[PDB]
Nucleic acid binder design. Structure first.
Lengths: 126, 124
DNA sequence: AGGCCTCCAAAAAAGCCTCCTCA
DNA sequence: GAGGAGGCTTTTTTGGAGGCCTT
């Protein structure tokens, strides 16, 4: 009954790279209200994030963030998963950033917490 | 806020919306703030042969010709890209001369150009 | 484990050109 | 002669694979 993956619509903004060592600097997490909440702060500090924001999604929270330096998805997932014994948690690289972020702000998805107000819509992390 | 480049001007701009026609003389609407900016950076991107700002209802239009010719679209990207605080309109110009003309005269005013005294007719 | 990288495939964007329809 | 639609080709921007290096 817990999500096996990200919600239907978001899926195409995301990376599917199964056989690949490319690293990147934008990521998303699907998890529980509380994990998100925690991670919000944890990741911010762990990865010196250049932006981050938390969102409503099917009575679940999604985390979305940009990093000053690149990382394997594997690596972010590894950091995330250790905070997490039973609660579900899915972590993926984002390909279409502005497109992802913007969709998490237009519903079903609404914002909750967020680093800069406005988000990508208001700053170019260029 | 304006929908488009003011009523009077339209007859000289392309309002084409399905064309791959490239061409080589263009325009832009913006707040003063977000306007003088491009006046420079366009030069060094697009290698321009002329350029001219204007006062346009306490706002700021922009005019220019290029050596090689371009998709309106492509320009409008290089512009939109650098600035999407505020706003920024942009079309290509079918009637080069007749544009510059009503721009440099009333109800408008030149605020700067790259050619001292700028372009007469001849030059087209 | 978790960063580095080039390489191409293939899509997206940004050119060239003729046209057809206005006049 | 315009000015646009759009067929077609050229150039640039992607992101998955996969091959390296450091501890």
């Amino acid at each position: 009954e817990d999500p096996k993956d990200f919600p239907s619509e978001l899926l195409s903004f995301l990376s599917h790279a199964v056989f690949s060592n490319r690293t990147l600097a934008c990521f998303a997490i699907y998890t529980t209200k509380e994990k998100a909440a925690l991670l919000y702060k944890k990741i911010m500090e762990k990865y010196s994030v250049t932006f981050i924001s938390r969102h409503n999604s099917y009575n679940h929270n999604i985390l979305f963030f940009l990093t000053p330096h690149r990382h394997r998805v594997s690596a972010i997932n590894n950091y995330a998963q250790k905070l997490c014994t039973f609660s579900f948690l899915i972590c993926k690289g984002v390909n279409k950033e502005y497109l992802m972020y913007s969709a998490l702000t237009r519903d079903p998805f609404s914002v909750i917490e967020e680093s800069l107000p406005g988000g990508l819509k208001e700053h170019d992390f260029n």
